[PDB]
Amino acid sequence: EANGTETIKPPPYGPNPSDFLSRVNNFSIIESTLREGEQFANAFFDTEKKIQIAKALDNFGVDYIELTSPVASEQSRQDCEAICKLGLKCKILTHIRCHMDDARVAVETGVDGVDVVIGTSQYLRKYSHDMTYIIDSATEVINFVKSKGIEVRFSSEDSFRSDLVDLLSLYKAVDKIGVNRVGIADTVGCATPRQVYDLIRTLRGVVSCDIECHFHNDTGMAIANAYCALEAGATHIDTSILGIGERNGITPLGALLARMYVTDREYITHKYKLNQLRELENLVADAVEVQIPFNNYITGMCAFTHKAGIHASTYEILKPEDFGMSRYVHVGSRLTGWNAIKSRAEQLNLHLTDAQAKELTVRIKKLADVRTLAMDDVDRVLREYHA
Amino acid sequence: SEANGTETIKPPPYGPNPSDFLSRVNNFSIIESTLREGEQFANAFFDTEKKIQIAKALDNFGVDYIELTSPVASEQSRQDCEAICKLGLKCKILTHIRCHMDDARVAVETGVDGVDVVIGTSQYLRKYSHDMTYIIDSATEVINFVKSKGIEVRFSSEDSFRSDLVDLLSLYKAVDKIGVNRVGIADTVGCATPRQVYDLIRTLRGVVSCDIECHFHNDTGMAIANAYCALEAGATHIDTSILGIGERNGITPLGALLARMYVTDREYITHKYKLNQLRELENLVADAVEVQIPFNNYITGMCAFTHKAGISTYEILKPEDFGMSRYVHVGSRLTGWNAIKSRAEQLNLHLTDAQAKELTVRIKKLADVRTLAMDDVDRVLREYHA
Numbered sequence: 061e062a063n064g065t066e067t068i069k070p071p072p073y074g075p076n077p078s079d080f081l082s083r084v085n086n087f088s089i090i091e092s093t094l095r096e097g098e099q100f101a102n103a104f105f106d107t108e109k110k111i112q113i114a115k116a117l118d119n120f121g122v123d124y125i126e127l128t129s130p131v132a133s134e135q136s137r138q139d140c141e142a143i144c145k146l147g148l149k150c151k152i153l154t155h156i157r158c159h160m161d162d163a164r165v166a167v168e169t170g171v172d173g174v175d176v177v178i179g180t181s182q183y184l185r186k187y188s189h190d191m192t193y194i195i196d197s198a199t200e201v202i203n204f205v206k207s208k209g210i211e212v213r214f215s216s217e218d219s220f221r222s223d224l225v226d227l228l229s230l231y232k233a234v235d236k237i238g239v240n241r242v243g244i245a246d247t248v249g250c251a252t253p254r255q256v257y258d259l260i261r262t263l264r265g266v267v268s269c270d271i272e273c274h275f276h277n278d279t280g281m282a283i284a285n286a287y288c289a290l291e292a293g294a295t296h297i298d299t300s301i302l303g304i305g306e307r308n309g310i311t312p313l314g315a316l317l318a319r320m321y322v323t324d325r326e327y328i329t330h331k332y333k334l335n336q337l338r339e340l341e342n343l344v345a346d347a348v349e350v351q352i353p354f355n356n357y358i359t360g361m362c363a364f365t366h367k368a369g370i371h372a373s374t375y376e377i378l379k380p381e382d383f384g385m386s387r388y389v390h391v392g393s394r395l396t397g398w399n400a401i402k403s404r405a406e407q408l409n410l411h412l413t414d415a416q417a418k419e420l421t422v423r424i425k426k427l428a429d430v431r432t433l434a435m436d437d438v439d440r441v442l443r444e445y446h447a
Numbered sequence: 448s449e450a451n452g453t454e455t456i457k458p459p460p461y462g463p464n465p466s467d468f469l470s471r472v473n474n475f476s477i478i479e480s481t482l483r484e485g486e487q488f489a490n491a492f493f494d495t496e497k498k499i500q501i502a503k504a505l506d507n508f509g510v511d512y513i514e515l516t517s518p519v520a521s522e523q524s525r526q527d528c529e530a531i532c533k534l535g536l537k538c539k540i541l542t543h544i545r546c547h548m549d550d551a552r553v554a555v556e557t558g559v560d561g562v563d564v565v566i567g568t569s570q571y572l573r574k575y576s577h578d579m580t581y582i583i584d585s586a587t588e589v590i591n592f593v594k595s596k597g598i599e600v601r602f603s604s605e606d607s608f609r610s611d612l613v614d615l616l617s618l619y620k621a622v623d624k625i626g627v628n629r630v631g632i633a634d635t636v637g638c639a640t641p642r643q644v645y646d647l648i649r650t651l652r653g654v655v656s657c658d659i660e661c662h663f664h665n666d667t668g669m670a671i672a673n674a675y676c677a678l679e680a681g682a683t684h685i686d687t688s689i690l691g692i693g694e695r696n697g698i699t700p701l702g703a704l705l706a707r708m709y710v711t712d713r714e715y716i717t718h719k720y721k722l723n724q725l726r727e728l729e730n731l732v733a734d735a736v737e738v739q740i741p742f743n744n745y746i747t748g749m750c751a752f753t754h755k756a757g758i759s760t761y762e763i764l765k766p767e768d769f770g771m772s773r774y775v776h777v778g779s780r781l782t783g784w785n786a787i788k789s790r791a792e793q794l795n796l797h798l799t800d801a802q803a804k805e806l807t808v809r810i811k812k813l814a815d816v817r818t819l820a821m822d823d824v825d826r827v828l829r830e831y832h833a
């Protein structure tokens with residue numbers, strides 16, 4: 061009787077004009093473990109380690125890897141040269157301040173492009189016969205770099221706290237000069253997704269070149285902001301392995317990939333070697349001496365777990381085979397010692413030998429001897445082993 | 448200046464939009480679900496004493512609601528509800544139930560302030576009558592029963608972003624006609640996106656007149672961003688979990704949420720919640736479910752308040768507001784006591800000459816097993832308080 065209502069139906073429901081601008085299954089990662097990652101509290105990468113991380117990334121499938129400025133130190137100039145000489149498939153970028161010395165050094169090292177950042181004293185606003193200009197000094201740099209055949213991206217810092225009048229006018233000016241990309245950076249970690257959406261949609265209307273986005277994760281928006289940026293027309297996203305960067309970091313590589321996988325499995329699965337992801341995180345985890353968080357996306361202990369029983373299959377939007385794993389683990393009890401190793405190793409496709417099981421089981425004991433295990437102890441103890 | 452410049456892009460009197468009036472970003476309630484959804488975490492096995500501490504600490508922290516596992520799930524579960532409903536918490540106490548008169552009867556018996564009801568496909572139908580949606584007579588009895596005993600009702604559906612919109616919105620409307628405190632939306636699977644969430648919540652806000660609760664899993668990194676957009680669109684209640692703990696990688700984490708809402712409105716959050724108690728709260732749960740605080744955990748993880756030094760403008764979170772003393776400026780790999788000292792002073796622990804020793808030996812006995820993690824510093828210090 062009184063427990064019903066007329067059914068709410070809508071009043072031909074194909075794609076919206078806005079959908080055509082979306083880059084959600086056609087974008088590039090710019091991998092920044094070797095620039096932004098160097099600002100992580102425990103990053104002290106030496107050349108060899110930089111080289112490995114670079115090879116692994118190129119092999120994993122990213123389109124670009126960004127390096128710390130060559131001008132920053134002499135060790136950087138060298139490492140830049142070193143990495144530019146490996147023959148990687150992906151393009152190699154370096155980050156510079158907007159200056160003629162920084163650029164000369166940058167192209168000397170052999171990069172494929174410079175990510176240029178501009179300072180307030182390098183552009184002005186004035187009425188003339190109101191008008192906004194890049195100064196003559198600055199503009200020469202862009203032209204220089206262009207004339208040496210190198211790609212130029214142009215950015216402003218703290219993009220979400222700048223005057224919009226300033227920012228947009230500047231990006232338009234730079235677009236008239238002609239560059240490959242303009243970048244947007246949430247340095248401070250304060251941007252919200254719909255706010256990111258409006259800004260990129262507008263930028264996409266203002267300029268004609270490509271658009272790059274860089275988001276910090278202070279407030280848990282880095283992955284969401286990158287997503288909305290892609291929806292609005294952004295063509296490139298900076299990521300970092302495990303997100304490592306300044307403070308709690310930027311858009312994490314794996315997290316981004318998890319989100320884009322759900323949106324288009326075929327595209328992500330074929331472009332990137334997803335079963336290589338654990339390996340990639342472990343190599344960085346080792347160098348910066350951190351543990352893979354228990355709740356880390358895809359690769360953390362509990363990402364692929366279902367509670368069995370008293371607090372409990374088609375709620376599995378991520379398929380473990382696509383990322384090198386074998387199954388969701390159905391957890392009904394607190395596994396201890398060997399039991400816990402066996403479960404994770406099996407999930408992870410490690411074909412452990414008789415002796416290895418022992419070496420591990422013994423070590424896990426010597427650990428609990430010091431204090432109680434954490435469930436991240438299981439992943440740590442297994443870090444050295446491969447599928 | 449030269450040739451290559453442009454005319455300044457300027458807009459064409461600007462104030463708040465009508466949409467802004469519906470936002471709940473500085474006026475919402477947390478429903479804290481460490482004791483329901485958190486029980487589904489791979490390593491969660493809370494006994495009664497531990498459930499009691501967690502409830503007391505959440506109440507003190509300032510959350511408005513705490514959610515408990517269904518009293519029909521098990522006997523221990525029934526008893527723990529009774530136990531917690533008797534503690535005299537300030538916050539309201541809710542339990543989660545399948546929509547059945549038996550489950551409802553025992554929920555009222557235990558003493559809850561409210562039942563979060565989830566309905567199953569067999570309990571509502573579409574039919575033409577002189578295109579109509581109905582909640583079934585025996586399902587509806589449950590709602591009225593609960594209301595007749597003076598207990599709050601929230602009604603929801605599972606896997607809301609994957610349900611047919613026709614069914615879902617029709618059901619919520621019918622429910623609203625019957626009359627309930629709240630309806631709920633849940634992204635059970637972790638696939639929803641913030642603009643999707645906004646659209647759906649705004650529409651729901653237009654369909655029903657009651658309150659709106661949201662539940663978001665974090666499989667794809669959207670849980671916090673979904674919570675926020677849900678709030679902008681009119682949602683009134685967000686489910687959280689300490690450290691996000693739940694099924695798989697969990698739901699919107701309490702700490703993370705509070706960080707996001709803090710930036711949006713410092714005064715509101717700082718005054719409503721005891722932010723300097725977040726760490727102790729996380730550590731209590733970390734201890735029980737035997738995990739370590741992620742190094743990049745929001746606010747409280749080792750690296751949240753670090754600046755690299757080397758080869759105050761950029762500090763949207765103020766360390767003093769969360770009981771800490773400063774951003775640490777890192778130029779070196781601190782080792783042994785150096786690293787303890789740094790973090791301890793950052794966390795405002797005034798350690799004894801003796802306690803420093805106990806810690807230094809222990810961090811050694813730890814690195815003498817395998818090379819250290821930055822997570823180890825927070826781990827050895829877990830037992831110490833400001």
Ligand SMILES: O=C(O)CCC(=O)C(=O)O
Pocket residue numbers: 096175176177215216217218243244245246247248274276
């Ligand atoms: O040039 C950029 O956009 C990156 C600089 C940066 O790390 C930041 O703004 O956080």
Ligand SMILES: O=C(O)CCC(=O)C(=O)O
Pocket residue numbers: 484543563565603604605606631632633634635636662664
């Ligand atoms: O009652 C609800 O809506 C939440 C149930 C749940 O945990 C979920 O949908 O993931």
Ligand SMILES: [Co+2]
Pocket residue numbers: 096247274276305306310
């Ligand atoms: Co940055």
Ligand SMILES: [Co+2]
Pocket residue numbers: 484635662664693694698
């Ligand atoms: Co859930």
Ligand code: NA
Pocket residue numbers: 264265266267268
């Ligand atoms: Na355009």
Ligand code: NA
Pocket residue numbers: 652653654655656
């Ligand atoms: Na309404």
